[PDB]
Each structure stands twice: as C-alpha cells, then as structure tokens.
Write a protein that binds this ligand. Sequence first.
Ligand SMILES: [Mg+2]
Length: 646
Amino acid sequence: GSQELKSEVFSLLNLDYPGLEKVKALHQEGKDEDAAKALLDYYRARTNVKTPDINLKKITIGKEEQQWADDGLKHTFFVHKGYQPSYNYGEDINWQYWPVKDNELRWQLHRHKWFTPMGKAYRVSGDEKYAKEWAYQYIDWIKKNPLVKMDKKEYELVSDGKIKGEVENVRFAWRPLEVSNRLQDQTTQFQLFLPSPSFTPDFLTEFLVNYHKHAVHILANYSDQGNHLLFEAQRMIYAGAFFPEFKEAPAWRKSGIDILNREVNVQVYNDGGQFELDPHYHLAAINIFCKALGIADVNGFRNEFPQEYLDTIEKMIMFYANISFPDYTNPCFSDAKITEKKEMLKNYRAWSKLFPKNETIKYLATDGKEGALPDYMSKGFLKSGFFVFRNSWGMDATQMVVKAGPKGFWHCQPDNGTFEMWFNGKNLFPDSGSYVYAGEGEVMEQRNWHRQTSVHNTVTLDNKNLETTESVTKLWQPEGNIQTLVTENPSYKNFKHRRSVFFVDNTYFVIVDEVSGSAKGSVNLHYQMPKGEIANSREDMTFLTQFEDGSNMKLQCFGPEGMSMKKEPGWCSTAYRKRYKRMNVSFNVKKDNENAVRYITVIYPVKKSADAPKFDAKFKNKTFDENGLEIEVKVNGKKQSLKYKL
Ligand SMILES: [Mg+2]
C-alpha cells in the first residue's frame, strides 16, 4: 500500500508497441491510472514472452528455498552460506544492517536470494501472504536504497542524517554485479507474482521504473571484462527481450549482443576451443553464451545475433563433443572435474533446441534414437591444441585425447603432451586431476602437487615442471590406417621435447618421445597408471592389466641402454576434494651429453589381459632428426614400420 503511480513510466514505454493501444489512448487522454491498469492487463494477457529460467506449468520449490521464503516472511534474509543462521533485519527493514564489517555480507543482501523462493512458495501453496510481503519488501527496498550520484564537492554539502548513509549505501545496493543479477531474477519474480492482487497497476509502474533504472545503470557501468561482463551483457539481453515494450529495449539487446559476440572472438579459438584449455570452462562458456542466445531465441530475437556468433557456439559444442568420451565424460585436464552422462544429456537437450538443424548434437541429445553422427572419426584442434584419436563413437570405442597446445592461464597446468585413453567402458589413463581450488591453503601442497608436470603423461627434466608451455603441432594425420600426431615443446632451456603418437590399425598406440638439446639432467618419461592391481615388470619394462575383463591394457617402454624404472606413489582426482591413490611410473635416463634421449612406448588395449601381445620396437635412424622419423614395431612377430617426414 506504499507504492505510488510513477507516471514517468509512460515516457519509458514504446506506447506504439502492438498491444498497448489502450494504454496509449488512456495516457493521451490523461487517465494515467486507467492506463496503468490497462498496462497490467496487457502483461497479464501477454503470452509471446517467456524465459527459460522458469516454467509456469510445473513450478516446484525445495526445502531450502521453502525455509528461505518462510524466513523472508519474518524479515530473516538469507544472503550468504557463511552467515548461518540468517540475520533478521528488523520489522522496519534496515538494509544497512551490518553486524560483521564484511562487504560481501552487505553486497549479497541486495541479491534478494529469497524473493524468487517466495514466488515459488506463493505459486505452489497459493498463499497470498508471500505475494503481499514480497510486494511490500520490493517497494521497501526501492524507497530505502536510492541510486544517487554525488561527488566530493557535492557530498561535503550534505544535511546531517540518512542522506550520506544512502550515498554510502549506493556502493552496496547498486554494485553492477547485484544490479545485473536483479535484472535477470526480477523477470522470474515478475512471472511468479503477476496474477496476484498485490500486483497492483501502480506497483507495476514502480516495478517498471525500477527495472529500467537497473538496465540503464548497467549500460553505464559495464565491468572490466571477466565473466562479470559476460553475465552483465547476457542479462541486458534478458532485460531487452523480456520487456521489449521499453523504448530502449533493442538498444539493451544489441549492446549485450555486441559485447558477447565481441568476447567470443577474444576467448575462443577458431577451431572451437575456449582459450583456458580447460574442459570445464569450455562447457561453462558454452552455457554462458547459450543462455543469452536462448532467452533471445524463444522470443524471436535469434536473428539479432550475428551468424558468426551462432557458428562459433556450434564449433564450441562440437569441440566438447569431440574431446568427450563415449560415456559422455570429459578428460580431467587443467581444473576440470568429471561431468557424467545425465547433466550432459540435459545440456545436449537445450543446445539441441537451440540448434535444431544440427544432426550430430540432435543425436547426442537423443542418446542414439534420432539424429546422425559426424562424417569423421579422429579429429584435430590445432589452434586449441587438442587431438582426438577414435575408432568408434559408441561404448566400445578406443579413444585417446591428447592435450598439447599454446600457453594457457592459471587454470591450465604444465602438462603439454599428456593424454587420456578410454577403452570399452573405462578410462585407463586418467589425469591426476585438480582435487582442490586455490583455495589457500592446506590444501596448498596438494594444489601445487596436482599441478606438477611429473604427475602427468609427458616428459620432465629433473622431475621439474615445464619452464615453457608453448606446443607446436608439427604433423597431424587423422585418417587411414596409420594416424599420427607430431607435436613438440621447448620445455626447458636447451630442451626440445618431441612426442609422436601413432594410432595403428584402429587398435593400438605407439608413442615416440625424443628429447634433444644441450641440457644435461635426468630425463623422466612419466606415465600415470590407473588405480588397481597391475602387473609390474622392471626387467622388461612392462605393465599388464589385472582388472575385470572389459577394460584391460598392456604398456611397454623401449628406451636406450641404462634406462631405469621408478614406481612412485601418485594420485587421481575425479571430483572436488575426492581422490584416490594410483601408481606414477617414470622411465628415467641420465642425459650427460648432447645426444638425444629417445623412447618408444607401445600401449595396447585389450579385453582379456591374457590376450595382450608381446612386442618388439626399434628406431631406424641413427639419432634424432628434425625433418623425419622412422621406427619399426612388431606385434607378436608381425612387423609394422612407422615413419613420417616433416
Ligand atoms: Mg592435471
């Protein structure tokens, strides 16, 4: 009962918009209150606008949100999981209540994390108490947290009371992060509370004036890049698409679009991969861009996005699908945890709705029933630095994903050349994982330990982390019987590590690791074994799988004279704070001169371990050559020569 008729709303509206003819007529007659009521009728009869954040047909609420709404009725407001139980902000709500001088505690109060739970409780229970108290608290927040603009010369000439508590409050109640969050969440609040008798026409005027204020404030205080900027632009598309009746709604959309389309070209390589080289942030970026494309798509603003934006998103999805395993799992490179098949099924459902004409993602969403598969098998991503060998897409495939690209950031680990192998149902070479964030600290030694190069499947010098992560793709052959990847990295000073990976007969792999340069030290070819019972053999340098028949493997390393094996303890992390022990084997060679140190490791996946072949392998050239390589292996006696020219 505190809301007013904010007549200025009619200057914010495009009254020539289809459906507001009665609003325009009544406004031109001076009957602004009847025009407000007519506007409410318009929104209550409008059906061509929606959001993917909520489905009014099936509105549910959990016990957590239920407690948040019921507490919110008592003016007990949930703001922060670190501040439990939630504070009570008084009957006369003091939005400046600050018992612990923590700016997060005060910032996150203006999130209104309990507003939408009150809407959900209102719809599921039908109890008007939630709507009455929500409308009251909404008007209350408007009247107690104004958006004022003053400078030092103006601020010094202030009264002597709540004027400077409000000016000081602007930095807490109107930080662009919470302003954008409210821009998105208040569309949900709008859908939830609109049919209520508390949603009066003049409350609608207050609502639209306040929302417009948020939009124009974000438009003048865009963030300093980071995902804060992506979310701000996305939510400006939310504001422009859910309330297209505003005169500035197109400008709010274009802006957001113009920002997002500008940043996808900054952080996504042309081959599809996102520039963090982390599967988790690739997926998260896909969802951030797809959420904006989504709320613009359902309301008929899909074509306001440039075509290159759509095709870039498509390339990102195809990237994640290519680096993923047939069980929909992702490799644990960088700081990525494992995503299982259910969540990815949901993702492919949404993106499949956004890209209907794309047959491959239509297949991955349908889980096989409908759609089609790509016309290729092994796929290369030479700009991102990810290379996928595969002989199948189904649950019987042999797949290897090799990570060897340019420098990343503080999420990319020094693991250039490492890989993950997935065979017939199980990942046989899992990454060491991330285990903990950053995140300091306890927890710090574990972080730096998992970030080590010596805990991956690559080459180290003195078991030290790589001084340079700048892989160069020398060769990529994805088709035919002999598929091969040649990549090299200047890992240390006077240290050129070249790795060649050969997918042979769509069955087995041969990894040739040639280290050249003037650097002298202990060269360590590391391999991170899976967890379980594994047959050691230090005399012939062999490891043979003793697992349940389904995913077995036999690996043998052929090195120079004097090569030694070291079975060290190591770890594998699949989930946050979750981890298990496995064996970290290192094939070490003392490089005391300038001659190259060369290895030929054969990896043969097999169902029954007793069927694992014995092998032979030898180099053909005298030493390391820059422009070519010839080796020869033997499978149970049958010869097979590998060679290429650069
Ligand atoms: Mg790792």
